Design a protein around this ligand. Structure first.
Ligand SMILES: CCc1[nH]c2nc(Sc3cnc4c(c3)N(O)C=CC4)nc(N3CC[C@@H](N)C3)c2c1Cl
Length: 193
């Protein structure tokens, strides 16, 4: 399974250089874009955290949390743990840690993984009035041996392109790193223009 991804990351993300590091962001963001395409997500936030980890927040329906007959596991766990808009488990495998929060039906469902391995069963941790999915991951320096430092301009350039290609979407990029905090928000208008 995912152990193959950790041993041959070049086959899954193309490169283990800075290019692969940035590719991880797109693998998660693309899933949020798919949920905007489905018609449910209206806004996506991408955040470079102070430690060069990444948080992606959308306001779509939330990844399904029900048990699948086929697997006996919650659908959300399978998304992150089974190799397959199909790249989430690759990002998981190539991260020291990934945590997912699903905001759905008034509850927050939470699961975390370490180098792709499940920490604990999906659990309800809070109540909520919002809906959507939040994925946070810390890229693995064992994999990304050249650099684990994000390029805000590189991310922002593509976020702007994604806003344009998905006209109507609100999408932002935020840098929370020391001495360089910044945020750019993009939204191209539809027929309301
Ligand atoms: C924050 C990133 C994100 N947001 C996400 N939001 C959703 S929301 C969603 C998607 N598909 C369905 C549903 C929600 N629901 O509620 C019912 C049937 C299908 N799904 C997700 N999945 C499901 C399959 C894969 N594309 C990743 C994601 C992912 Cl990953």
């Amino acid at each position: 399974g995912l152990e193959a991804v950790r041993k041959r990351p070049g086959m899954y993300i193309g490169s283990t250089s800075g290019e692969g590091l940035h590719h991880l962001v797109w693998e998660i963001v693309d899933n949020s874009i798919d949920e905007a395409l489905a018609g449910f997500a209206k806004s996506i936030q991408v955040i470079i955290e102070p430690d060069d980890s990444i948080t992606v927040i959308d306001d779509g329906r939330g990844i399904p949390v029900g048990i699948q007959a086929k697997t006996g596991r919650p659908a959300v766990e399978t998304v992150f743990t089974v190799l397959h808009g199909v790249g989430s488990s690759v990002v998981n495998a190539l991260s020291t840690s990934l945590d997912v929060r699903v905001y759905k039906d008034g509850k927050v469902y939470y699961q975390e993984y370490r180098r792709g391995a499940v920490v604990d069963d999906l659990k309800v941790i809070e109540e909520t009035d919002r809906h959507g999915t939040t994925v946070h991951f810390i890229p693995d320096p064992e994999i990304f041996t050249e650099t684990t430092v994000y390029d805000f301009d590189k991310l922002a350039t593509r976020v702007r392109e994604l806003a344009f290609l998905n006209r109507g979407l609100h999408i932002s990029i935020e840098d929370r790193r020391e001495g360089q905090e910044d945020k750019k928000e993009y939204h191209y208008e539809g027929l309301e223009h």
